[PDB]
Amino acid sequence: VLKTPKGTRDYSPRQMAVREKVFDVIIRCFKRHGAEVIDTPVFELKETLMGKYGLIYDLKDQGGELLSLRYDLTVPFARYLAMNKLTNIKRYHIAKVYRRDNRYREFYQCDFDIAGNFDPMIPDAECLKIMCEILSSLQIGDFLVKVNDRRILDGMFAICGVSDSKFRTICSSVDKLDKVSWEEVKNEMVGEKGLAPEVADRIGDYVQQHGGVSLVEQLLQDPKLSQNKQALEGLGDLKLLFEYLTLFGIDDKISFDLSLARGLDYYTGVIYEAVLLQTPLGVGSVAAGGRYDGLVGMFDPKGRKVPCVGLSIGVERIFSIVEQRLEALEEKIRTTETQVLVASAQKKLLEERLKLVSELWDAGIKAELLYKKNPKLLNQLQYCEEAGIPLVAIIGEQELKDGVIKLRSVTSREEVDVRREDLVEEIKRRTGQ
Amino acid sequence: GPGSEFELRRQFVLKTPKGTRDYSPRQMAVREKVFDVIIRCFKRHGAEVIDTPVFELKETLMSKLIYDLKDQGGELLSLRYDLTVPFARYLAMNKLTNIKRYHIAKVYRRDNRYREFYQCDFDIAGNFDPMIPDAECLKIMCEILSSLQIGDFLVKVNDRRILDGMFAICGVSDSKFRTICSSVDKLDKVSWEEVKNEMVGEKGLAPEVADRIGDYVQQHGGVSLVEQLLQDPKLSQNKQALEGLGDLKLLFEYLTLFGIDDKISFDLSLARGLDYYTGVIYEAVLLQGSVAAGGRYDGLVGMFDPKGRKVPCVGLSIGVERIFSIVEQRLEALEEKIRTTETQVLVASAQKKLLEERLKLVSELWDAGIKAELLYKKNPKLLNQLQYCEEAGIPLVAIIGEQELKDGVIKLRSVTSREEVDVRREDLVEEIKRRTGQ
């Protein structure tokens, strides 16, 4: 019966160590952009989640409110904003979400969002900048951020002749163009979904193109698209976006891709998705986001609109990559931060070690000793070697009388005598405070 | 007007579940400060960390206080009510016989922010020499309680074996152990007479028997009290009491070496968590609340292992929810504005048409690891930018103007002092670093 629920896994000490290094990079970035932080309960009223999703963990009806586990951090955010009658906020939220999909049922989401009425595209641009800072800093190899706008999509599908009835499914097909070829995608829309091959080929004339600001300029000249009001504003915003990206120094990491069509329940403005590269060959997505201006309005009692743009870093995939990067380097990932083991080779010294280890703790030094009265020096050394503990402070009967400690570097094997009074400052010096 | 039914219905559902609440940025600043103290202590003691799913199999957690997940055609799941039972499952499942770990995570209880709340656990599992890990747990509690600077505190200590032997030697029947413990436990809230009456009148104990319990249970003291009970005519003939007292005497030797023997109060009325604890039991009290508990529980892991293999465990739980409030009140009483962001500088301008230049600059600052912001406006008024800083606690404003750009210069104004000085652009990163301490 010993088992974690399907789709969940524990984080082992080593996995926690990597998670800490990855979160530390991400949080340091969020904080650099003046983000506040909040937290919200792991479950919300079922009502709060109902009427938002077209796969949600519900809690047993036990005689109170009907409750559900958060499927994401964005809805809780909207509920939070509305509940506190906030009109603007810049926040990050790092927490687990829950989905009965098919470690994929419980996993971390890492969100940053900017809510408020501001001038066009400036916050949207900062979101892309934040993506890029983070992905670069993690050093998970090269990447590329795909960008599109919801209104460009709507307009493109309007003038190509896609019905409102098939709009939703056709986007699902187009959105596959990242992994698969246009030939497959075309054949699906036509063969499986009953889309006219005339419409399919027209969509193709747009959907197959990608590039930088150059493509935004071309489509602003497109005779058919120009005459669609929505596509035109969307393109105007992207043109603006590219200007700001250039100033942020990251226009070379951005690809305007008209096949990007996801999260169409939420997104009203830009849509983006970061993808890892090979060698530009897409190897998988590691972040996503966009502008969703209708969500908060759905919660505010007076339906007051609060624009929002934001991003989700896909940390689960990043945990794997970083873990494997570390493994391939023979770099032993430490699961503890102990700086020194207090040891002795002789017997009858437990009380002396207890006294020393405690002095070290008092000075704020990270120390341990074996829970054994007369451990063998070899066993203590082996313990340090496996744990990556860099120093061993060896206490002996004579050395105590002399007021010295034998300090041995575990890896270099070099041993030096240190005055007891100098021991605390000497350990700090060897580790870096 | 009061508002349409449309409006009032929406307001009616704009809430967090009962007995839960969001953490605002202000409360997150407090919680981050508390957790930093605690985690720095855990790490200082060589602890590893693990994490477990918020829900375990229902069969694993066996109550009218445990959240169950709806049967949606699959496993029957429940939300965890603590971290110790997930730990035991974790040790048994991974066939570990020793681990020293801490775990900080929310737990869930349908009791009467009190249904979802943080537990901060530290545990040392494994077969070791007597009472050293136990001593270290008390040290850890003492380090943390001290560093949190939440006033003076005390740690009550007792042992299950001492209660066992003590009940035996003064007449209690073995089968009435638990309920008499439940009564004795309330002597930190209630008088001995109220307690006695509940044991005799309610619990069917004999008057003579309860009186002998009162002779011991009413007592609390230091290491000298341990020595006295080792001299006790009746107790010192009971094997359990003898072991229990022997171990406390030893614990005290180690607490003296750790310089915390003066914070420990041996208290015979401490009888908590007897579903778990097989050795030491303890509870920290703030002096003017239950702010940290723990003890040794050697049978729990054994109950999850198929071959019933025992793994000795001793640990502690820090009541982090009571501390959050105390610390927040400390901060608010100082009227010290709690910042919710770390921004060092706002990039600003008074003139129009400089958005592009603020974008370039703020991005330069970000690339240098400086915490910077700018208002999301094409042409903000300087006043609005300065007010934003004043309200948020941002100490510097970097003002870009057309002339400054030509001179390769940036006007850097202190938000508090209002003094503005010119700064060569290439020096800006360093000049900011200096003024904010980095």
Ligand SMILES: [Cl-]
């Ligand atoms: Cl001023």
